[PDB]
Design a protein around this motif. Structure first.
Motif, PDB file in Angstrom:
ATOM      1  N   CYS A 128      19.193  91.973  32.938  1.00  0.00           N
ATOM      2  CA  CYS A 128      17.758  91.715  32.903  1.00  0.00           C
ATOM      3  C   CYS A 128      16.970  92.946  33.325  1.00  0.00           C
ATOM      4  O   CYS A 128      16.027  93.361  32.640  1.00  0.00           O
ATOM      5  N   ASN A 129      17.352  93.556  34.451  1.00  0.00           N
ATOM      6  CA  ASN A 129      16.643  94.739  34.922  1.00  0.00           C
ATOM      7  C   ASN A 129      16.794  95.903  33.957  1.00  0.00           C
ATOM      8  O   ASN A 129      15.855  96.687  33.784  1.00  0.00           O
ATOM      9  N   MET A 130      17.961  96.036  33.326  1.00  0.00           N
ATOM     10  CA  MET A 130      18.223  97.215  32.510  1.00  0.00           C
ATOM     11  C   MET A 130      17.566  97.158  31.134  1.00  0.00           C
ATOM     12  O   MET A 130      17.707  98.120  30.369  1.00  0.00           O
ATOM     13  N   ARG A 131      16.835  96.086  30.820  1.00  0.00           N
ATOM     14  CA  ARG A 131      16.290  95.952  29.439  1.00  0.00           C
ATOM     15  C   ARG A 131      14.763  95.855  29.441  1.00  0.00           C
ATOM     16  O   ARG A 131      14.172  96.092  28.378  1.00  0.00           O
ATOM     17  N   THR A 132      14.153  95.503  30.573  1.00  0.00           N
ATOM     18  CA  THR A 132      12.682  95.329  30.628  1.00  0.00           C
ATOM     19  C   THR A 132      12.190  95.557  32.057  1.00  0.00           C
ATOM     20  O   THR A 132      12.721  94.908  32.972  1.00  0.00           O
TER      21      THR A 132
END
Length: 48
Positions: free
Chosen positions: A1-5
């Motif tokens: 989740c953190n690495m995409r947005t």
DNA sequence: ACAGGATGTATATATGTGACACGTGCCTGGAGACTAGGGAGTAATCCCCTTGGCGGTTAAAACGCGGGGGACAGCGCGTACGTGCGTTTAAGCGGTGCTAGAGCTGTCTACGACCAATTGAGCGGCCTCGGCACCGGGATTCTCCAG
């Protein structure tokens, strides 16, 4: 989740604003003296 | 879960009371040449009203929440309206058979328009009192529980 947005932090509201940064410093320095403060600002939704 | 018993269609047919076709005529478009007046195309003036919105405070909405008394469903019953049947009333569907009065035509004024003046309402533009508007009593009047 953190690495995409990446969402804005929203927690430390002093992030973008140097006014709030220097205010944080100033209030922290005054807290040792504990003599209390009035913070005046117009813009009713800035008090928020 | 049927079947007399009615009522409603569906399809066919024909000739006669209304739908189309054809010729005429003759009032009415169509075509044309002048003469404004009307309206369009800009060019100036005066307004109002949005500018972007903000943060104080208010009235009006908006929301909570009880509860009560009306909106419905149920039940009944008791007329009363349709249904059908016999009668009879009187309308319809054709006729005869006047003359009242539409509809028209013509003729000719009184009537309408024009038409240039003329002036006197009338409409705008300020001014200045009365008259409603809102207020603040207190006294009659309703509304709501309470016996």
């Amino acid at each position: 989740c953190n690495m995409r947005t990446q969402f804005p932090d929203l927690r430390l509201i002093q992030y973008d604003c140097g006014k709030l940064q220097t205010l944080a410093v100033l209030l922290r320095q005054l807290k040792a003296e504990g003599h209390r403060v009035l913070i005046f600002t117009q813009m009713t939704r800035m008090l928020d």
